[model samples]
Each structure stands twice: as C-alpha cells, then as structure tokens.
Target: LQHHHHHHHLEGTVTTDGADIVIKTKGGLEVATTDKEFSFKLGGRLQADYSRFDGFYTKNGNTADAAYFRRAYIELGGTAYKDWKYQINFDLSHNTGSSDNGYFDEASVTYTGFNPVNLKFGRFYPDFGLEKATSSKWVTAPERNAAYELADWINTHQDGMGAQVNSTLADMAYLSAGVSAKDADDSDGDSVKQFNFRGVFAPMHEAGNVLHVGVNYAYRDLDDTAFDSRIRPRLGMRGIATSGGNDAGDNGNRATFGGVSNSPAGSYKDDSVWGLEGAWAMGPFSAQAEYLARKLKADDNAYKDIKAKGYYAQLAYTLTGESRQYKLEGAKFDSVKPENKEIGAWEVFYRYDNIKVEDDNVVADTATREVGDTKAKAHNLGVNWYVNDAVKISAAYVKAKTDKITNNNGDDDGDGFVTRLQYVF
Candidate 1:
C-alpha cells in the first residue's frame, strides 16, 4: 500500500525552507517538516491526444481530425496543522470549447482530523461514481463513459463552490454528499445550485479480487434556464482550436449530436438525476458499468420536458498479470504499475456507451444541423501501455453512431481513431 507511488514519483529532489525537513517520493514530490506537522506535494499530468471522426457530427459530409492537449495540469497540495488537507490545481491546456476547460481546475481544503468523517470546502471534484472517482490518467478508456458526463460537476465546465462530507466504515462502505454551485452564464446576480450524494459498498476487496457497487444522486436547480443536453463528441479534438467563449453559437469547431434549436432560454426548472455503478476486478480481468438517468422539468406553459439517460459497460484485462488496484479511501481504481520496470505493463479494454434524450419537441431533418433529441452511442476499444512508472501510451478506435438527423441521408454514424501520450510526476 505504501508503493501507491507509481507515475507520480517526482524525478528530482526539490526541497525548500531550512533543515530538519524530510523529502520523499510518495505519489508526488513530498516535503515534510522534522516534526511532521506539515507536508506538501508537487505533482502534475499531461495528456496529449490525436483524434479523428466523421458521420455522427458531420457538416455536409465533412470528416474531422486534429491533435490537441486534453489536459496539462499542475497540482500543489499538502496538509497543515496535522488536521487539514488542501489542494490547488491549474490546467495550462484549457480552452473555450463551450468554456468547459477552465484554467483553474480544482481547489479545495479538507479537514482530516475527524478520521473517517471528513469535511471539505472550496471548488472540488466530487467523488460521485467509480469512473468519476478514478483519476483520468488511470481510467480504462481515452474518455470517460457517458454516465460520468451526466454528472459533470467540477473541472469539466464550471468550477463548483461547495462543501462536502465523506464518512467511511472500515473499508467496507463509503458515503459522501456535497452541495455546490456554478455561476450562471448571465452573471445577473444569479447562480445554479447542485446537490450530489454517492455511496459505495464493498463486501469483498482484496489483493486481486474485489466487488464494488455504488449509487449516485445529483439534483440541479437551474431555475429559469435552458437545458442543452449535447453529447459532446467523445473522440474528437477536444479542447483544440478554441472557438469563441460560451454562448458564441459556434458550430464549425464544436462537433456533437443531440441539441435543441427551439428550446426557450428560460424554460427548464429543476432536474433530478439518479445513477447506478458497479465494478469488479478478478485477478487480471476487470469490469465496470454505470447507468445515469435525469429528467428536466419545464416551467409553466413551457415548450417541452426532456428526460435523458445513459449507460456504459466496460471490460479490461491486464496482459502482464497485474490486477488493477482498488482504493477504499475514495472508492477508486489505481493504475497497474509495471511488474518489470524495463518492460512496463499492458492492458486492453473495451467500453460501450449509450445515451439518449427524450423530448417531444424534437425533430430530425436533412437540412438542419441542430436537430432535436439524442440517441447517441459509442464503442471504444483501447490498449494501454504503461511504459514504466511515469509514462503511459494509449490507442483506441471509437465508433460513434446515433439514430436520426444529419449524417448523409439522416443516418448519423461516424468513426475515429484516438491516441494519447501521457506522463505524470
């Protein structure tokens, strides 16, 4: 358990302040005082990718391909007073593709003096689901499943200001709840509020075998605002070719399926989302799945009410005979560090995602690019070459398809190849 220090091992020695301080590589560049009252860590991740796609988001039969940096992050975190933990993260590779990639990613302070019961505040990434809890560097696929997208709270779009509490029961059960808010785009002294609750129960969790089941609930009070449920293209140049800011009404650079053209600006009311998540790791083979469903309520005499749901199932196997590690601290899966540092670890995975939106005031026609509703699905097959502790290479083939509206004769389908080069320290 102490060797959870894999890729995040800083390469060199860096310490500050006077003597009587200790330095170590423990999942980051760690510095601690002689009395061990305070500690700090320096770590970061880089994800550069190349992706291509067509059909599903075609504009007049035009296929798309590009290369970009999905995330380039630097994390500064530590604990102080032997009771508090804090973190500050920065994303250098941020863009305005719907303004989802903000520069300031995650900043939070947590109180750990309470043992299993801890309290946190600031803009944080909520531990809502199995995949959502796992770090992006270790997730099985290039992009997280659609189910995680439905629970987008922090780092992706708007930073959330909230408080959270997490309680655990001796590595057998974990519970968490958070209430966060996002500044409304209008900025007219208005904001959106969200509440999230997640729980995990693991009856069997050990070295090479474990069973994890979790439930997620998210409620949003959008008040008078339009809910645009767009399944942003999963296998495309994500934050590259930054277009205008949010509400730019730009389409050439933004590619995706499922959007509404006639929804009023102030039409939707509160929203309720429910989710189920399950995962198991048996020796070198592992599997995970999640389902998320949400319904948007319309205001008085509103045009329509929409319900969206999505699910993803994935299977993975480690070729080097190492099993993916599960951490009860956050109900997350850890990376498979190579058994032989010279050869590295290899893992293959397959994932399928299906998401759809049900709205009566939606239609699909040949001439409209912003066709209604969504019935999108994606199949992702990938392999990860964990080339030592600090580097990882991944390649995946993605096939994105949707039923109805625009993709040469109203048959929305497309394919893409995605590759990623990652490093962390």
Candidate 2:
C-alpha cells in the first residue's frame, strides 16, 4: 500500500502591528494589521474664528464684526495595501443656509511603491508654492500671507484631476513637478491646463539650525472665454466674508471695492507665474519670505502683456524655548511640537505683505475696468499658544491699506482684530 503525503496551504493570516494601531490625542485613532493589506484612521479638526474690523467695506459702511466656524471637518484616511494610501475629508460646519449640507474637501489616492518617487492622483491641490503647499492646520498665522493669493490665478487649490511625482534628490534637495486639467465641476466649455514645478535646496541643515531656498513656476492655459481671477486685501476666509466685490465686470456697482479683477474679455493664451521662497530656523527663532510674479498674454490683445507682483516677509519666535522644527526635504516650516506636554508652547510672529498690478490701466476695458492700477499693503502681529498637541489658541492684530479703491477715510486703510480657537485630532 502506498501512502500519499498531503500538504495544506494557508492563504493569509491577520495580525495587528502595534505601531499601526495608535490612539493618540493629536492624530486620533488608527487601526491596521501586520499583513499590510488594510488600514483605517479617523481624525479631524475644528477652528472657531472671530474677526472685528474697523474699516471693512460693507453695504452700509459700518465696522465689521463677526464670529463663525472657519473649518469643521472630519478626515477619513487609510491604506489598501502597504503601497497605496487614500484620504477623504468632509466639511461639517457652515452648511446651515444652503441646501448643501457639507462637501468633500479632499479626495485622493497615492502610490508610494515607486521608491524615492511617489505618485498621487485625484482631486488634490497642486504644489504651486511653499505657502500654499503648507496645510492650513499647520500655518503659523490665522491666514496665509496676502501674497499667497497669487496662487488663485495660477491654479493652486481648485480641486481637479491630476497626477504628481515627488522625490528627494541626493539627500540635500527635493523636487516635484506635475500637470493637471481643471476641475470639471468649475470648468467652462473650454479646457484649462496647468503645469507646475517646485524645487528646494537645504544649505545648512542641523538639529538646531537650518536654512532653505527654493523656486517655483506655474504655466497656465486659461480658457480665454472663461478665465477669471480675483483677490481681496488680506483678511477674511474664503466664501465666509469678503471686503471686495466680484472682480468680474458683471458686478456693475462701482462703490463696492476691496479686490482687483483681471478679465481680458478674450481668451488667455498664456499666464505664467514664478516665485522665490526662503526660510531659516535657529533654535527658538525663525524667519520666512516669498515673492511671486505673474505675466499674462491675451489672444484679443486686451492686454498684450499684463504683470502682477506680490511679496511677504515674516519673523517668528518661540517663547517656550521649543525650536521650530524644519522639514528639510520640503523646504518648509512644520508645526511646532510643544516643549512641555503639560503646559504646551507659546509663539509670537510679525508679517508684512504687499501686492500691486502693473498695466492695470491698459486692461481698463476688460472686466478689471473698475479697479485699475490696484495696490495693497498689509501688516500683522500675532500670538499663538499651543494648549497641547491637539488644541491651540491664536490672536492677531492686522492693518491694511489699498489704492484709490476702497479708500476709507483719507486713505484706503483698515484695522482687524482676529482670534481663533482650534482643535485637531
């Protein structure tokens, strides 16, 4: 009699990796198994923002004071495999008036198995500049500097279908480049294309001291029939409140002022933007600066060559003796990890930003006819206290001035007092 030997095979076994299952106050709950096939994490943030303005443009021309939820979202993210990651975030606040309860803030998938380079696709922000690239949850100021608004015209944060590749180079520099088609939801009949790239170099990188420099460029093919861009004077969050009127010429009222619009009435053939960024951190002190410029050409020659420029400089110091951490690879400052888990951390900062449009007079016939030769300057002083890894409080005093547009008393100027209560998990 011959006996046959039998063997059994197990498809897979599941086990939890201690590192993958973490319950923390700052990042929230995460669950994963050692098999590297499935994982899930739940987290979100809430920010209560309040602002009081001494000279905000309103229908009645009265001091503007208001309080509301700036950001209220629940973030869901995880991995399908060790190499594939995904995230979906939804806004949970400020949908009271409209039928829209809430909307998807971000939805994207990333593949990381490509070694030093990573690929991302879906509805996500394009890496246009260091300031815009930094998540709002980690920004030092209540809002991004005024100059950062240039990104709106260059295709920075509008949700769109796109692919991006980012990688580290020689351990001293990092580079990223990508192209994207405009979001179908906001698209006109014509197609809009964007090409963007950024590179950063770290010269002095160490535990206590670091210096970084970088450059970025964006080229946009805006649908001449549908291209529109507008910017406000450096206050108020998006869609919440604005001191400026719609930059589009459609808004016939000339009394409304606080923003500049660039509408060529014809298709935009080429709109190119370039920026330079620098940052340094030494122990508890840090500084950052950026400058941006844009050039536009129109098919109808409404403005053959239009130029706009903006710049901002900032200085910050940690009063709690915690050195501001620097992300060398990205050439940007990261969130401050409080020195004392019990008492948290303290920080104070000051910033100044300016923006101007050249050839505004030439585009007078375009949608920008109302606000020609636009200029604005702003300064801010702020204080922030990190109550803990998951909670923070911030306040700021802001002052701004503009050109003939929105000229309040003797000059176009305003004062703003703002505060925020923030929580992240």
Candidate 3:
C-alpha cells in the first residue's frame, strides 16, 4: 500500500494601498517531513504623489502631477536541505518610474550553520551605511531625503557576495563583521569580484526596551570596469543645511566626462564609508536615527573623493497600552500582535529626514569648481490602527523640498507631497 500526503498554505497583508501575499507548500503537515521545500512571497506598495512648482529640473520648466505604483515585487524562497536556503526576488518599480525596466536589486542564498556567522552568495545589498540597509516597510517616512545622498558612500544599492558574522557578548554587547566583492551592474545577474568590509556594534541588551546604538563602516575596491568609469570635475559648492549645494557646472544632471565625471572633483578611486545609528524604545514610545558618509583614496580628480549623507529621526507612541513584546499565558508574539486588546489598539508617528550629494574637497575649494552639490529634505507622518491580531490599517503623508542653488540642474527646487494606505493580515 502507498500513502501520499500534500497540502498548501496562504498568507498576506492587505492595505488601503495594495496587497502582499505569500504561498507555501510542505511535503507533509509537519516540519520534519524531509521532502523538497517550496514557497513564494509577494510584496507590493502603491502611492499617490502630487508635484507642484513654477520651474524645476535646472531647465526651470513647469510641470504638475504624476501617479503610479511605487514598489512591487514577487519573491520566492525555500530550503533544499536542512542547512541550505535560497531566494529570488524581482522588482517592478521602474515599469512606472522609467521607460525601460532593469535588473538592479537583490537576490541571494544563505547558509545557517555558521552559528554567530553566516555566508551568503549571489547579488546582495552592501553593508556600508545604516540607512542603506534598513527595511523600507519599517521606515517612518516615504523615502530617505536628499542630504543623505550627498555624504553617504555610493548612493546606489550595490550588489556583491560576502560572509557576515553577528554575535552577542556578555549579554550586553552585540557585534557583526562582513566582507564582499561588488560590481556596478546587477542586471546580468550574480555578483562580480569587488572587495569590501563592514562592521556594526551595539552596546545594549538585544531584548531590552531601553536603548540600541549602532555604528557601521565599509571598505571597497571596485573592479576594472568601475575603475574605468570617469568622474565629473569641479569643486567649491557649499551644501545648504538640510540641502546639499553644488558647483555651477552639472546643470543638475550627472556629468559624463573624466576628472569631471562622478567622483569628488571627478576622481574615481578606492574608498571607505562609515555610519552611526541609534534607537530608544521605552514604555509606549520609540525613536530612531541614522547617518552615513564615505571618502576615497585614488588618483582621479574628476570625481573627488565625494561624500553623501542621510539621516532620519522618528517618534512613535502606542495607544493600546500594550508592551512591545507580550505573552498570552506564556505564548509570546514579537514582530506582531498587541499585548492588550481592551484599550483599542492604535499608534501614531512622525519623522524628519534629509540627504546630501556632493564630492569631497568642495569644502577646501575657493573657486566655483564645486558648484554641483545637491540637498533634499522631508517631513513624514503616519498612523496605524489595529482591528485585531489579523488585521490593521495605516495611513501616511510626506512633504519633500529642494533648493535652487547653482549646480542644482534646475531640478524641482520647490516642495512635493505623497500619501499611502496599507492593510496587514
């Protein structure tokens, strides 16, 4: 006689904006069945944005509104064996953001037996700055502001393969270390050889409700193709507070020449990047902030050892009167579920953010070679209400602004706004 067992499972989140779903299959109803594993997860987000300005984009041409999908992706993952896991994710943001879509995001495999450390392969996000790695779903704002782009290293979400080790020591400190090789192009798929290192430190108990402070750093050496990429030349741009200033050249567009291409003063060399972040969660309130910056070490003046910086601060209060982590007669829910249902679950939050994009040496320049720097800022507010453990609704709004400095390339020098709605299950 033969006995065959099979089944499927469904999971998802429903928001006023869109739906995110996950489907999975198991060889049997239990976790020990040893059959090949398979599962798929869907992620999507939508936004309604309104733009208004008399003149913008350095051309100072006037334009009004545009609306479409902000983020949409389908991710699939499963375990082939006990210690092995794999995942593949695809993003559809560009179908609305640009003309031709591309392959420029994340895909990787992880091995879990490394204890405090794990090794991952395939194209992956870099570990340089704190802001670059935070999950978008958890962000208090619509997106990171412009000041971050100016002083942070390689604003792009770079890809490479590497190993990461995370551990806790003496029950009071946490640490992590990693290194990888990076390639500018991720569309072809997989990772190319680029060398880099990253580390993070946290001095508080991982499970405490008090404080969590972190610091991170990265070192990188791109391949020949990236090395050959030219840098934009120029200097002496004063980045405005909450906004980055630029030299008079660039016209608000990426320069396309050597010593004048993309590096600080147009020089493209090896570089090191660093960042710091902090969070406080006590009682019914919580707050978090982070910043990143990079410097170069090669002989290309076109793109000076440029710098980019970004940071966000947010505060939140839960009206449910529930603890961050709660147990029901001994069962605990960490990432979700509320502790008390008697008070009507609800939460409200607000965040402020800024990003700056500028090359290095602009500070020392007495001339106008550094006129192309850029700075951007924003304010975001959000509200979340829970109907029960399986349902919730969220509403968020944001206001963003830029400047009209010399190198700003006529880009939107005014203010913009956006809104979103989401559901959880």
Candidate 4:
C-alpha cells in the first residue's frame, strides 16, 4: 500500500476536520474546526497599547503627563458551510486611555462563495467610507492616521444589516457595491438608519504592478426627542434631564449622555456623508489615500448639530518585492511564492495621515464649544516581521498634532511622539 500526504499553506491560520486548531492564550480565544457540511473557525485578539497626548489640554489641565493602556477585546468568528462567514467582536476594556469607548465593535455576516456576489448581515462594516471599515490590524501603523478619527467622530457605527456584491469585467478590473440600514449603538428608541453605496477597481492584474480605486456615499435620517416625552417616558416620568445652565433659560433634561469625551457632539435631523479612497502598488512601492465628509439638517435652532471632515494619504516601500495582502480570517502573512515558501519575511513601510474636526453650519449660537476646530496629523514609520506561520510583529513610530489656538483645546502634537507594538497569530 502507498499513501501521499498534502501539506497545508503555512501563510495564514486555518482549521482542519475537528481535531486540528490554533490558540492564543494571552491574547484571546480562536477556534478553527470543521464540522460536517459547514466549516467553522473562531478567534480573537487583545492589544496592550501605551499612548500619551502631549501639547494636549482638557477642561481640567494639560495632558502632557498622561499615559495609559489603550484597548482590549475578544473576537469570535468562523465560516459556514459554503461561502458564508460571521464575526462578533466586543470591547473588553470599559475605558482605556484616550481611545473612544464602545462596548461592541463588530457583529456581522458575509458571503463570498458566489462570483461577483457577496452578501452581509448584522451591524458589520460601514459601506459608505474607505477608512471606516478596514480592520485595525490590516492598517500600516499601530493606529490609523488623523483622517480616521476626524471622520468617524460624527457618524455612529452600524447596527442594522446589509449586503455586498463584487464582479470582474476583465482580468484586470473589478466592481463592488454594498447597502445597509443602521442605527446608533444601544439606542432606547429608533434613532436613525443609514444607506450606503460603494464601487471599486483593479486596473492591472499582472506586470508586477496593481492599482485598486474606490468610492462610497451614504445617507441617513436624524431624529430628536421632546423634553417632556423623552424624560423617563417609560418609567411614568420624563427621561433623564440636564440643566440649561447659566446664560440660558430654565431648561433641564436627563440621560447618562454617553459622552465621547474628546469628540464632537450634537443633536439634529437629516444627514448625508460621502467618502473616496484608493490604493496603487507597483514594483516595491505602494500608496493609498482617502477622504470623508458629512452634513446634518435640523428642524429646530436648539437642535442644530454638525460634525467635521477628515482625509489621509499614505505611501510606503518594502525592501522585498512582496507587500501586504488582505485576508479572509483577519490574519495576514508576509512571505508567499510557488516553490520558495518564505521568500519575503520582513518589510518596512511609512505612512502619513491628517484628521480634523471643523466648525459646521449647524452650530447653535447659544452653545459654548470647547474645541471649535481640532486636527491630528502624523508621519508613521513601521516594520512587519513574520517570525513564523503562527507569529508576526508590527511596530511603528507616530508623530501627531492638534491646534489649540484655533481649534481643539490644544491636544496638539500629541505627546510629541508615540509608538505601537502588536503580536498576532
């Protein structure tokens, strides 16, 4: 009798049959197992980040002396039978450092089995913008540039459901479109729903050169609550109330007000947001850029609200001919080739980003804004090293800025310089 065994690709993580699996103890939980008709795999990650916002100021005082851990989380996901998959990601850290606080980051389902057609459900990625939906680990730096922060502040994460489809007109070109309806996280009542459309392209499939370009747009309806009806309306009383404070008439409302802490906040109705992003890679060099902007419409002067606009551009080069590649399991591999499995093992890259919060047309005349205009821009230099199939390290140095004189309470050039370190399996 004679038998031959095939080897698995050591690039990314995967599960076989039922016994074979991958595990990360210190980070989180992930399981890859095959069951009958449906293929299943689970995984999660935890990041211990140190951040310092210097040239920074708050209502209390200067933040140059502040430094702390940034994020912690657990993710669960796997594939279902054919071309379908799902993911549930939750934030374990209640409040960490200066990072925006949220309980849930991802909960969605996707389909990629059919050609030119992919469907997704649950509160997954926002299809309206380029930067909003990209996985954090896939980013070139430890953290996204200023553009991500500025644009994300105004729009809430998705909460409803949606679908995505992709097709190729030729070997070198492809197209994609997605739409969804979503609302603010954990909203007591129906806050609002959003719809989005997207398109993408790859100009060259061969010649050791490639280009991916895309655009996105979204629309939403905003709503406000009445002081009397909203205040404790369910408990036979008014909803949580807040004081109108001095200079204003006697007005009070109540609610925990899940404050963003260091971001723009407001109330209004009817909103529209649009974004554009693209990437080009040739030889050993590559570049990517994106922009996001939004507007809000209100019926009452007191309810007037507005957000900001942000954009970023990045370019990088690798010593090896190989570059970064997107993956289905959120796991990435550096080296790939036909006979030589580990040809390109380590790569260095640089990125630049600029994000801002600017004064909008809807700002209420009666309101007192702490940070009228704020911006954060940075230059990031980093390296990705693949030690083996199960381990990889990504590190980068970032320099940022925020203006206090014109906008932002002076959280400028955050702590002068910051660094990021990540380990993934």
lDDT of each: 0.71, 0.68, 0.44, 0.46
Candidate 1 residue pairs in clash (backbone atoms < 3 Å): none
Model 4 TM-score, all chains together: 0.65
Write model 3 residue lDDT over 378-399, tens digit each, in one string. Answer: 6667666654553445555544
Error of 3 at 193 (Å): 5.3
What C-alpha lDDT does candidate 3 achieve relative to the native structure? 0.44
Best by lDDT: 1
Please rank every candidate by lDDT, starting with the best: 1, 2, 4, 3
Task: Please identify model 2 stretches exceeding 4 Å from their true place.
Answer: 1-27, 34-37, 56-61, 94-102, 184-190, 205-207, 235-265, 359-372, 407-411
Per-residue error for 19 in candidate 3, Å, reads 32
**10 residues in a row with least lDDT, candidate 2:** 244-253
Candidate 1: Cα lDDT at 300: 54
* Per-residue lDDT of model 2, residues 239-322, tens digit only: 125222211122111232222254543545677889998888889888889999987765664444567789988898989988
Candidate 3 wrongly placed segments (more than 4 Å):
1-63, 94-105, 129-132, 145-148, 151-163, 167-174, 185-210, 222-266, 301-303, 320-345, 354-377, 384-413, 423-425
Which is better, 2 or 3, measured by lDDT?
Answer: 2
Per-candidate TM equals 0.85, 0.82, 0.63, 0.65
Best by TM-score: 1
lDDT of 4: 0.46
**Cα lDDT for residue 128, model 3?**
43
lDDT of 4 by residue, 1-425 (tens): 99999887668755555554554443434444433234444454444443333232222223332222234446677776657787777755533111342456677777777644556666655544444445555455555555444334223353455555545554544445555555442235654456656665555533235566666676765455222111010000010111111110111111111113222223455666677777766755767788877564555665434555667777766565555553212111123222224653566767666554544441333222334554445566777654443344655555544442211332233322334344443
Compose the digit string of candidate 1's lDDT tens values, residues 1-425.
Answer: 36554575567766666547888884679888877679889999888887655555445445556667777888999988888998988777763122453566678889988898999998766556788788887988987776555435422326547888998778798899888877564225467787889889987666468898999887877666544545444432242233212211122334444445344456766678888889888899998898988777776574566677888999999999898888887888888878978889999999999877666655544453545665767788889999988899999988767655444435477666778899988
